[PDB]
DNA sequence: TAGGGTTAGGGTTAGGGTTA
């Protein structure tokens, strides 16, 4: 593969342009401000496959939104000078003060208009602002900058990557068209193809081709803790290799093509006699690592030659990532950057409690953790790997303490057994992840949200919701700010007869839809419960926004999601389709339902950038009101409620026949929907004989009816 | 042979090791400590850890200049502040300074085998019998302080009895503590960086009973013979007024302990 | 917050070379403890000259007395009509064995350095 | 002139930034602050973040969770703040063996010693370590640590107030540090001041220009006819040092430029970037980085373990590898060139180094 | 073929304006 030419693809505009599916984005403002790195895959006709390509864009101009004042205000005496405000006056003041004291040479200004409906005060609802475009080379203006004509400026410290991607309306990994290609004299990455892009306007969004296959690598290791200084170390490698894993269907078979292993020895013990002879007799493709530096170099070289894209493992971020980094640093392994894709030497400071440096160093590739995926997918008894295998594969997993490890080095066959155990563990984890199909689900979630692919893998629902809100508000010409439960006590009793349990669906989204809860449609003029100063035990919750008002912004998107879910559930009922299409529909709906769930958590979580306490307080008040209304109207029908929680409520039945339970549940569903059409309840389960013991504990024989009208009593305790 | 140079170019000569193998050269007469000798045409090689030393070859001539003095006299180490080591003008590598302890990083105590140096247990080795013909245990201790004199900051490492001297404990207390810790076998306190003993040491290490003004006689940790200029300034995010800011910083000095006394 | 305490050797304050109401800290050797009237007369030698300073003690009772010992007194000075100069004690500690010449040279050197730094402004 | 404070990006280069400085209390009262970063203070070009004071306590006040202390050091008075560390969840002992009973007794002794040491009354001697904070338009000293000093003879205070002026006169009343040198950023146009420095500067520029074109074979006159290289070489200092002939001023200037270019070329040669060949050409050199055949040969010989037996330890040392490469291909091979070849081979993930100067295959 | 293990490590924040 010659590096002096770029595999440009000719298009309808008779221009040899570059088409690629971007995957990862990187930036470094402290070293090369205004520089954005993009990673992706580009098809090669000569090799009849796709290879990694590097495209980097320079010449990024900052965007500012000055907030003008309606009246002139002196900056030294704080009094009005008696003159009005005009755009020319603002520009002249800016030129003679801001550029003079901040050394600003190049600047582009033009009066613009935007919309503001956030929680930040001292901002008019609608005004004619000014957009100042300048490079990042000059120092950034202070975030709290105030002038005679302008009281604030917006977008002071917004990331260049965000503005770059948002100015082109990009929704996650997608096909792109790259014009005006420039060759690179000195390659800076390990990718096969590197490109030099000069202007941000040379990209257009293409969504007409399915993404190409990627590389998924699964691996694990063994760790030994030194007794003298508690310095952990890594013993053996094991990994399973797949080359062309699909990203648009179920798990292909076979899920792997090859596997390799390498093991070493500690600083005291020695290898068993004739280990090379034993390997030759066994004929197993296992390498012997002479030293820890040797194994590290071999592992990194194998990774670089393979050049993977998706890496997976167990608790990698928690322990394995920093253990590997510490081992690399201590052993002084040359060219540590080969794990990622960029050639770097200044590794970020490890040991960060938040782990920011850990994710920063891992740029260029996709990293997935099985623990977070399992937590966000289903509910399990425990997060331990053996428990997951029991819940899925029903296979015993051996945990070997150091007592057996120390004498494990006695015979070669014992090491063969240990490495076989490690390889089996890797294969089991690979099977567990492939049957789960977490990666296609994450890809669909990213496509729906349009945010960064990598950030989804860490379970950052707040970030994806924030980016979705950013897309929605930018599509509506808005300015965003910068970045830094009731328990019910019903009638007390114990009932050993049948207990019917139900749970509402999307209580908070239903509340938002019914009452049009949105930033642009909710005011903050009340004295109800939440937002007032400390003057007594009385504060302010916003009242119900008027339904006759213009329908809100975020309810529009959640209604669009509901419509798409309804279309999907209408589509799946049709027969004679490929099973992979059915799986795609199911994962798509499930992604939609998780997005609907995360809609509430967008503002529920305290750390939200657009956190709005009044909206959360209103949501809680409406939920409590709905809960009390539902409980009262249910109990008016001579149906005592034994317990309820927000939206999951079970009603005492004191019956035995299952048909009566089903009919009563259907009647309850018919009754509850009358007041709220958008809010509906579902059969969560039926208990044959429920017994109550203490808080968060219950004993019941769960009802699992068959198609013959009968039921099977299965016991569940917690 | 450990020799110290002497030249007019630098008034602080660096130390140097001269290795004389004996497959063909028994030592010549006159080589004694405290005697000035002259050398010529030695073979230089670079160690694995980037050290400089001279090998003694067949093309080497040795000439003795002066005899050792009849009595051995000593000169106290010069007194200096810790700041002058960061200025490239004729800085010494052995000196004494008046400083004050800030905090600790870690503390380690050992009971190793007399032969294989493995961790002992109640007077027996982990690999006893296989590689141990006798039963004897010897204690070791490692500490890592962080001192300050008034114009700089450096990290100091002590070994053996120097940690006991630095903790301000009488020998009876040290012996009692070593006997008490002799039974478990090992105690590692990663008190900083990346059982009643734990709380006792945690209480002791963070009290003014140890953080006292001390007089330190320190030796530069990086041996003067070693050469490795590879240090560009780093960058971190010190913040004081609830407002982070970024600034470059020099690498931290590394020292070694020779003698610690109170004041 | 009070005003700081500047050092002053006994013979200067004995001659009244400080403004009234100033805060000073000096030294000397006790000679008599007038019990009823709460008055302390300490003395300090200077060659063939002996100087006397009167110390009110109304703010440090209870207070043990060590006859014929050195002392350090910190407070404010009030020029009385007939009694002359008396210092209002705020803290009064006892120090023994500390040599005077080191102290005198110490304040002399500190004053010299302060004046030297005062030569640039 | 408006005295500009040193930029915040160079504060850490000072050795004082991380230290506990000793100051007169009047100085810490009267010394100014910094606008770009509030919370830190600037004095005579030396930023200060931590201070250490000693004196006699003359004011005591207590609050809900923090103490108060007014210290005096014969020249001024400042407030002090000492937080009350929470001794929550007092540890309860157990009736273990005699060793644990003795250890608990020692723990109680240590606790009572600390409690006695930290008790403060009016008229004692206190030592304070910490930083500077401004609250309610007044200055205070937060305390990271503090303890009472027992000086019944006034030795430590006399020593302190004798030692401090020496510290000022030797460290504090000095212009500034020496970091990032001065003018070392570029060389203030290629003119510079030292002719060997001019040759050194020309060396990397010529190397970079050769790299940009990916030159495999070059002649010295081909580099000398380059206008940019001449302009970099043609400096006021080099013209003064090129006074060797008068009748041939142009010729002798060309000779001096040829000499400096050859000096840069041999400087590159000593780095192993370019080697030499015996082809009858004086000014012909080849860049070692692009010798693909040499890289393949070295990779093959390393795979064959440089003719070393397989049964011994895999890989070879630098010296044996150098000897094998010299004998197998060219007696004129230079050692820096082979070092560069080995480094480049390691870059392409061709071999692995178990440790320094010892490389093995896979 | 000559040093030991080579590891970078603490790097926040806390509140006045009061008596029997």
Swiss-Prot record, chain A:
Q: Please state where this protein is localized.
A: Nucleus; Cytoplasm, Cytosol
Residues with N6-succinyllysine modification: 613
Name the segments for region: DNA-binding: 327-392
- What positions are modified (Phosphothreonine)? 83
**Quick one: signal sequence residues?**
none
Q: Quaternary state and partners of this protein?
A: Component of the alpha DNA polymerase complex (also known as the alpha DNA polymerase-primase complex) consisting of four subunits: the catalytic subunit POLA1, the regulatory subunit POLA2, and the primase complex subunits PRIM1 and PRIM2 respectively. Interacts with PARP1; this interaction functions as part of the control of replication fork progression. Interacts with MCM10 and WDHD1; these interactions recruit the polymerase alpha complex to the pre-replicative complex bound to DNA.
User: Which family, according to UniProt?
Assistant: Belongs to the DNA polymerase type-B family.
Extra remark beyond the main annotation: In eukaryotes there are five DNA polymerases: alpha, beta, gamma, delta, and epsilon which are responsible for different reactions of DNA synthesis.
What does the record say about domains?
A: The CysA-type zinc finger is required for PCNA-binding.
Recorded protein name is DNA polymerase alpha catalytic subunit
Which lineage ranks, top first, belong to the organism behind this chain?
Eukaryota, Metazoa, Chordata, Craniata, Vertebrata
Q: What gene, per UniProt, encodes this protein?
A: POLA1
Q: What portion of the full-length protein is represented by this chain?
A: 324 to 1075 of 1462
UniProtKB/Swiss-Prot annotation, chain B:
One GO biological process term is: spleen development
The entry lists its GO molecular-function terms as: G-rich strand telomeric DNA binding; single-stranded DNA binding; telomeric DNA binding
Keywords linked to the UniProt accession: Chromosome, Disease variant, DNA-binding, Nucleus, Telomere
Give the UniProt subcellular location, in the record's own words.
Answer: Nucleus; Chromosome, Telomere
An annotated GO cellular component: cytosol
Subunit info here reads:
Component of the CST complex, composed of TEN1/C17orf106, CTC1/C17orf68 and STN1; in the complex interacts directly with STN1. Interacts with ACD and POT1.
Per the record, the similarity remark reads: Belongs to the CTC1 family.
Summarizing the function annotation, the protein's role is:
Component of the CST complex proposed to act as a specialized replication factor promoting DNA replication under conditions of replication stress or natural replication barriers such as the telomere duplex. The CST complex binds single-stranded DNA with high affinity in a sequence-independent manner, while isolated subunits bind DNA with low affinity by themselves. Initially the CST complex has been proposed to protect telomeres from DNA degradation. However, the CST complex has been shown to be involved in several aspects of telomere replication.
Specify the protein name: CST complex subunit CTC1
Swiss-Prot record, chain C:
Sorted alphabetically, which InterPro entries does this protein's record hold?
Answer: NA-bd_OB-fold, Ten1_animal_plant
- The molecule here is called CST complex subunit TEN1
Q: What ranges are recorded for DNA binding?
A: 1-121
Result of changing residue 117 to Q: 2-fold reduction in binding affinity for STN1
Q: Which gene encodes it?
A: TEN1
Q: Name one GO molecular function term.
A: single-stranded DNA binding
What keywords are assigned to this protein?
Chromosome, DNA-binding, Nucleus, Telomere
Per its UniProt entry, which superkingdom is the organism in? Eukaryota
Bilayer-crossing regions: none
Which GO CC terms are listed, alphabetically?
chromosome, telomeric region; CST complex; nucleoplasm; nucleus
Q: Where is this protein found?
A: Nucleus; Chromosome, Telomere
Q: How does it assemble?
A: Component of the CST complex, composed of TEN1/C17orf106, CTC1/C17orf68 and STN1; in the complex interacts directly with STN1.
Q: State where it is primarily located.
A: nucleus
Swiss-Prot record, chain D:
Task: List the GO cellular component terms.
Answer: chromosome, telomeric region; CST complex; fibrillar center; intermediate filament cytoskeleton; intracellular membrane-bounded organelle; nucleoplasm; nucleus
Query: Which terms are listed as keywords in the entry?
Result: Chromosome, Disease variant, DNA-binding, Nucleus, Telomere
Q: Please classify the protein's predominant subcellular localization into one broad category.
A: nucleus
Name the chain's protein.
CST complex subunit STN1
Instruction: Report the disease annotation for this entry.
Output: Cerebroretinal microangiopathy with calcifications and cysts 2: An autosomal recessive, multisystemic disorder characterized by intrauterine growth retardation and, later in life, premature aging symptoms, including poor growth, graying hair, liver fibrosis, portal hypertension, esophageal varices, osteopenia, pancytopenia, hypocellular bone marrow, and vascular telangiectasia resulting in gastrointestinal bleeding. Brain calcifications and white matter changes are responsible for signs including spasticity, ataxia, or dystonia observed in some patients.
What Gene Ontology terms describe what this protein does at the molecular function level?
Answer: single-stranded DNA binding; single-stranded telomeric DNA binding; telomeric DNA binding
Q: Which family does it belong to?
A: Belongs to the STN1 family.
Top-level taxon: Eukaryota
Q: List the gene name.
A: STN1
Q: Where is this region: Winged helix-turn-helix (wHTH) 1?
A: 185-289
Describe the subunit structure.
Answer: Component of the CST complex, composed of TEN1/C17orf106, CTC1/C17orf68 and STN1; in the complex interacts directly with TEN1 and CTC1. Interacts with ACD/TPP1, POT1 and POLA1.
Residues of the DNA-binding region: 51-149
Taxonomic lineage of the native organism: Eukaryota, Metazoa, Chordata, Craniata, Vertebrata
Q: Where is this region: Winged helix-turn-helix (wHTH) 2?
A: 290-362
Species this protein is from: Homo sapiens (Human)
Q: Name one GO biological process term.
A: positive regulation of DNA replication
């Amino acid at each position: 593969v010659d590096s002096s030419h770029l595999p440009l693809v000719k298009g309808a505009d008779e221009e040899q342009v570059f088409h690629f599916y971007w995957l990862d984005a990187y930036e470094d403002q402290y070293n090369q401000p205004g520089v954005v790195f993009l990673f992706g895959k580009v098809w090669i006709e000569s090799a009849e496959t796709h290879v990694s390509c590097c495209v980097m864009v320079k010449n990024i101009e900052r965007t500012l939104y000055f907030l003008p004042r309606e009246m002139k205000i002196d900056l030294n005496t704080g009094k009005e000078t008696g003159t009005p405000i005009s755009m020319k006056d603002v520009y002249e003041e800016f030129d003679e003060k801001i550029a003079t004291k901040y050394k600003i040479m190049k600047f582009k200004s033009k009066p613009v208009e935007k919309n503001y409906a956030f929680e930040i005060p001292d901002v008019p609802e609608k005004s004619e602002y000014l957009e100042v475009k300048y490079s990042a080379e000059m120092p950034q203006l202070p975030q709290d900058l105030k002038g005679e004509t302008f009281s604030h400026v917006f977008g002071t410290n917004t990331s260049s990557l965000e503005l770059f991607l948002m100015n082109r309306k990009i929704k996650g990994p997608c096909w792109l068209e790259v014009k005006s290609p420039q060759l690179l004299n000195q390659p800076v990455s390990w990718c096969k193809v590197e490109a030099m892009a000069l202007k941000p306007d040379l990209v257009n969004v293409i969504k007409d081709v399915s993404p190409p296959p990627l590389v998924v690598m699964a691996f694990s290791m063994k760790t030994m803790q030194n007794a003298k200084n508690h310095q952990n170390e890594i013993i053996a490698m094991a990994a399973l290799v797949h080359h062309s894993f699909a990203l648009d269907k179920a798990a292909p078979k076979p899920p792997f093509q090859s596997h390799f292993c390498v093991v070493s020895k500690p600083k005291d013990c020695i290898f068993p006699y004739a280990f090379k002879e034993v390997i030759e007799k066994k004929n197993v493709k296992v390498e012997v690592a002479a030293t820890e530096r040797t194994l590290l170099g071999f592992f990194l070289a194998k990774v670089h030659k393979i050049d993977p894209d998706i890496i997976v493992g167990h608790n990698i971020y928690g322990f394995e990532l920093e253990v590997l980094l510490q081992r690399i640093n201590v052993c002084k392994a040359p060219h540590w950057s080969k794990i990622g894709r960029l050639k770097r030497s200044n590794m970020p400071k490890l040991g960060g409690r938040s782990g920011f440096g850990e994710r920063n160093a891992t740029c260029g590739r996709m990293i997935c953790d099985v623990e977070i995926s399992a937590k966000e997918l289903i509910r399990c008894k425990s997060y331990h790997l053996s428990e997951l295998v029991q819940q899925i594969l029903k296979t015993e997993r051996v945990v070997i303490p150091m007592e057996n490890i120390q004498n494990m080095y006695s015979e070669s066959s014992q090491l063969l057994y240990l490495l076989e155990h490690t390889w089996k563990d890797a294969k089991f984890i690979l099977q567990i992840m492939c049957e789960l199909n977490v990666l296609p689900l994450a890809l669909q979630i990213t496509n729906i949200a349009g945010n960064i692919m990598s950030r989804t893998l860490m379970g950052g629902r707040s970030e994806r919701n924030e980016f979705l809100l950013l897309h929605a508000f930018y599509e509506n010409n808005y300015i965003v700010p910068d970045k830094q439960g009731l328990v019910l006590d019903p009638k007390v009793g114990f009932y050993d007869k049948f207990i019917l349990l139900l749970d509402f669906n999307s209580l908070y989204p239903s509340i938002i839809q019914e009452f049009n809860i949105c930033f642009t449609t909710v005011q903050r003029v009340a004295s109800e419960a939440q937002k007032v100063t400390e003057d007594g035990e009385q504060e302010q919750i916003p009242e119900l926004p008027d339904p006759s008002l213009e329908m809100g912004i975020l309810p529009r998107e959640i209604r669009k999601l509901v419509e798409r879910r309804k279309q999907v559930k209408q589509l799946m009922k049709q027969q004679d389709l490929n099973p992979d299409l059915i799986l795609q529909y199911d994962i798509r709906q499930k992604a939609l339902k998780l997005t609907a769930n995360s809609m509430y958590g967008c503002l529920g979580f305290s750390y939200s950038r657009f956190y709005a306490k009044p909206l959360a307080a209103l949501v809680t008040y409406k939920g409590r009101e709905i809960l009390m209304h539902t409980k009262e109207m249910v109990q008016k029908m001579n149906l005592e409620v034994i317990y309820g929680d927000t939206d999951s409520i079970m009603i005492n039945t004191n019956s035995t026949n299952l048909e009566e339970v089903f009919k009563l549940g259907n009647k309850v569903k018919s009754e509850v929907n009358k007041l709220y059409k958008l809010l509906e309840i579902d059969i969560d389960g039926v208990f044959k004989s429920l017994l109550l013991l203490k808080k968060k504990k219950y004993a019941a024989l769960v009802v699992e009816p068959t198609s013959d009208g009968n039921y099977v009593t299965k016991q569940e305790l917690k | 042979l450990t020799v110290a140079l002497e030249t007019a170019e630098c008034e602080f000569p660096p130390h140097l090791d001269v290795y004389i193998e004996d497959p063909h050269l028994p030592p010549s007469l006159g080589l004694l400590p405290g005697a000035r000798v002259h050398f010529s045409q030695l073979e230089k090689r670079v160690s694995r850890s980037h050290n400089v030393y001279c090998c003694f070859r067949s093309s080497t001539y040795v000439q003795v200049l002066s005899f050792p003095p009849e009595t051995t006299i000593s000169v106290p180490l010069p007194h200096i502040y810790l700041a002058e080591l960061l200025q490239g003008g004729q800085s010494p590598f052995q000196a004494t300074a008046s400083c004050h302890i800030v905090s600790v990083f870690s503390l380690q105590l050992f009971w190793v085998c007399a032969y294989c140096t493995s961790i002992c247990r109640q007077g027996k080795c982990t690999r006893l019998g296989s590689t141990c013909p006798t039963q004897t245990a010897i204690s070791q201790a490692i500490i890592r302080l962080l001192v300050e004199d008034g114009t700089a900051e450096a990290v100091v490492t002590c070994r053996n009895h120097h940690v006991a001297a630095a903790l301000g404990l009488c020998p009876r207390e040290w012996a009692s503590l070593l006997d008490f810790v002799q039974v478990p076998g090992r105690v590692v306190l990663q008190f900083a960086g990346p059982e009643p003993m734990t709380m006792f040491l945690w209480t002791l290490c963070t009290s003014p009973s140890v953080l006292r003004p001390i007089v330190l006689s320190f030796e530069l940790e990086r041996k003067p013979s070693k050469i490795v200029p590879l240090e560009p300034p780093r960058l971190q995010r010190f913040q004081c007024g609830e407002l982070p800011f970024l600034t470059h910083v020099n690498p931290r000095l590394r020292l070694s302990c020779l003698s610690i006394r109170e004041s | 917050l009070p005003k700081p305490g500047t050092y002053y050797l006994p013979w200067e304050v004995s001659a009244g070379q400080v403004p009234d109401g100033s805060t000073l800290r000096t030294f000397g050797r006790l000679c008599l403890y007038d019990m009823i009237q709460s008055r302390v007369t300490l003395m300090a030698q200077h060659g063939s000259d002996q100087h006397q300073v009167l110390v009110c003690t109304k703010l440090v009772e209870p207070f043990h007395a060590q006859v014929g010992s050195l002392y350090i007194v910190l407070g404010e000075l009030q020029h009385q009509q007939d009694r002359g100069s008396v210092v209002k004690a705020r803290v009064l500690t006892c120090v023994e064995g500390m040599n005077l010449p080191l102290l005198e040279q110490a304040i002399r050197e500190q004053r010299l350095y302060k004046q030297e730094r005062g030569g640039s402004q | 002139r408006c005295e500009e404070e040193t930029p915040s990006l160079l504060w850490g280069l000072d050795p004082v930034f991380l230290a506990f400085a000793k100051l007169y209390i009047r100085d810490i009262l009267d010394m100014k602050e910094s606008r770009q970063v509030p919370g830190v203070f600037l004095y005579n070009g030396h930023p200060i973040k931590q201070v250490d004071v000693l004196g006699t306590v003359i004011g005591v006040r207590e609050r809900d969770a923090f103490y108060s202390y007014g210290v005096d050091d014969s020249t001024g008075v400042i407030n002090c703040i000492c937080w009350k560390k929470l001794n929550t969840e007092s540890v309860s002992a157990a009736p273990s063996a005699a060793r644990e009973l003795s250890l608990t007794s020692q723990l109680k002794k240590l606790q009572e010693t600390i409690e006695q040491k930290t008790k403060i009354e009016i008229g004692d001697t206190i030592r304070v370590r910490g930083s500077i904070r401004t609250y309610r338009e007044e200055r205070e000293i937060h305390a990271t640590t503090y303890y009472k000093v027992d000086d019944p003879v006034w030795n430590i205070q006399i020593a302190r107030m004798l030692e401090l002026p020496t510290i000022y006169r030797k460290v504090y009343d000095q212009p500034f540090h020496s970091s990032a040198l001065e003018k070392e950023e570029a060389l203030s146009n290629p003119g510079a001041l030292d002719l060997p420095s001019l040759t050194s500067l020309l060396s990397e520029k010529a190397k970079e220009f050769l790299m940009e074109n990916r030159v495999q074979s070059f002649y010295q006159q081909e580099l000398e006819m380059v206008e940019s290289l001449l302009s970099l070489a043609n400096q006021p200092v080099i013209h003064s040092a090129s006074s060797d002939q008068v009748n041939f001023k142009k010729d002798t200037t060309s000779k001096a430029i040829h000499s400096i270019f050859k000096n840069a070329i041999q400087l590159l040669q000593e780095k192993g970037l370019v080697f030499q060949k015996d082809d009858g050409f004086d000014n012909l050199y080849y860049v070692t980085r692009e010798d693909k055949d040499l890289h393949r040969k070295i990779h093959r010989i390393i795979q064959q373990d440089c003719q070393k037996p397989n049964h011994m330890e895999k890989g070879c040392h630098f010296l044996h590898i150098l000897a094998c490469a010299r004998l197998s291909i060219r007696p004129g091979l230079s050692e820096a060139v082979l070092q560069q070849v080995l480094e480049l081979l390691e870059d392409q993930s061709d071999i692995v180094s178990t440790m320094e100067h010892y490389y093995t295959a896979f």
